[PDB]
Design a protein around this ligand. Structure first.
Ligand SMILES: O=C(O)c1cccc2c1OCCO2
Ligand SMILES: O=C(O)c1cccc2c1OCCO2
Length: 114
């Protein structure tokens, strides 16, 4: 509360570390369904169903232009990519399995890093 603060966690490296995690996700071999925005003109249903589209390139742009206030808002967008994936894809499909794999991969990196 006012004039009563927890000891200050060092956040100076957060930007750099999130960029690193994002790079490892971009270079993962199962990253391909998530590298670019879903084409809303060529994928019937997606625009109406998925209220907040998100992909790694959009995250990269937001990260690089100072649009994440903190590392929690970064993690939310990453998770949004995989939540979107589950909403639109069968678990038993290549894309559906890609999403499950990448989420696991992300969350481990996330815990190990912070
Ligand atoms: O999951 C999060 O949003 C988050 C935010 C700050 C620090 C963390 C976090 O996740 C676990 C590791 O340490
Ligand atoms: O992909 C799935 O496992 C799944 C999960 C919940 C509801 C469903 C599902 O697939 C077919 C439609 O209804």
């Amino acid at each position: 509360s006012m004039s009563v603060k927890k000891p200050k966690r060092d956040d100076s490296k957060d930007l750099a570390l999130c960029s690193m995690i994002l790079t490892e996700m971009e270079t993962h071999e199962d990253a391909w369904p998530f590298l670019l925005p879903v084409n809303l003109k060529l994928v019937p249903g997606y625009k109406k169903v998925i209220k907040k589209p998100m992909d790694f390139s959009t995250i990269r742009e937001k990260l690089s232009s100072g649009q994440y206030p903190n590392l929690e808002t970064f993690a939310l967008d990453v998770r949004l990519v995989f939540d979107n994936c589950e909403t639109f894809n069968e678990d038993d499909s290549d894309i559906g399995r890609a999403g499950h794999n990448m989420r696991k991969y992300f969350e481990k990196k996330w815990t190990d890093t912070f």
